[PDB]
Amino acid sequence: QAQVKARQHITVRLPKKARAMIVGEITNVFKDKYPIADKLKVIPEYDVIEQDLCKLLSPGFPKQPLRVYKFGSRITGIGNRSSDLDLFVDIGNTFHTFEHRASNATVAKLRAMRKFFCDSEDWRLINFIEQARVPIIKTCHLPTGIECDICLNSMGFCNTNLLKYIFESQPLTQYMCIYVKNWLERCKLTEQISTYSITLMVIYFLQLQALLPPIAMLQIEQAVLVGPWVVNFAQKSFSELGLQQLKATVPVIKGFLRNFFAYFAKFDYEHFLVCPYIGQANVEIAKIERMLHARYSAYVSDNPECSIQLKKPMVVQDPIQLNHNVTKAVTKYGLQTFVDYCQQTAELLE
RNA sequence: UUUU
Ligand SMILES: [Mg+2]
Ligand SMILES: [Mg+2]
Structure with a gap:
């Protein structure tokens, strides 16, 4: 317009x-x-989401390292109740590896994760964005109703920590x-x-x-x-x-x-x-x-x-x-x- | 072009 x-x-x-x-x-x-945004830096619902993500994905990746990281506006303290939750799923100690363009190994993990979300009753798959610079899955965590963006890139978590230090300081x-x-x-x-x-x-x-x-x-x-x-x-x-x-x-x-x-x-x-x-x-x-x-x-x-x-x-x-x-x-x-x-x-x- |  x-x-x-x-x-x-x-x-x-x-x-x-x-x-x-x-x-x-x-x-x-x-x-x-501000009080809402500050309270949203930590709520029990985030624990449920992290736990459900681990339960859902640990079978698909049988015995490899798996760790979930939260980031975005909620974690830094500028979110609101309608904000989504951004999550970095590290499979295979991928944290320290930067991909200018998503590697095939990275994209392969994302396609496998997609099916788990469809099949699961606890998640509603919304989008699968392989084409974006940071490929993500958009999915709703039905128990909490919180919309989640799942990615395999650690940079968001890293700059969220920086923002959190700035805001608190x-x-x-x-x-x-x-x-x-x-x-x-x-x-x-x-x-x-x-x-x-x-x-x-x-x-x-x-x-x-x-x-x-x-x-x-x-x-x-x-x-x-x-x-x-x-x-x-x-x-x-x-x-x-x-x-x-x-x-x-x-x-x-x-x-x-x-x-x-x-x-x-x-x-x-x-x-x-x-x-x-x-x-x-x-x-x-x-x-x-x-x-x-x-x-x-x-x-x-x-x-x-x-x-x-x-x-x-x-x-x-x-x-x-x-x-x-x-x-x-x-x-x-x-x-x-x-x-x-x-x-x-x-x-x-x- | 799509997370931060
Ligand atoms: Mg967000
Ligand atoms: Mg998001």
């Missing part, structure tokens, strides 16, 4: 559902959605991510700009305010790796880095949110990228690849096809899987819509 392409000189209007949230009192996140980050997440949904932009992408933009914004560390700062070398990617981070106390941990009040949340939207309304996406790995302002698309760690340089030297896709309208770099522009699918019209909504949202916050 691109009116933007036809009338690029016209600001695409902020949807009313979004307008009414922004214009309305922001207290909902501070007093209602600097709770303002969590409040902001819950707000922009709901904003994104009311703006109907989730198909282009994901919740995860906007979380990285919030973290990067807060890094520029000297309230969060650069992720590279937390990885000075021993290192834990998933292929060429450094997935461990030093859980340094923010006091040790001089980072003050703010008391998140409605006024302070509202001020950072307004500055967040204002910043990305005026951000130069043509020459710069969102870079929580470097965590410094004005990180140029032209110089980013030379600022990455030796394992990336080594990895792209032998595999140039695996380098980060920088020839896109919007570049947001995953701070761990440094070869991943998480906004690579955003179109110039989708970006323009995002910019317009940011602009109009910043105004409504004053």
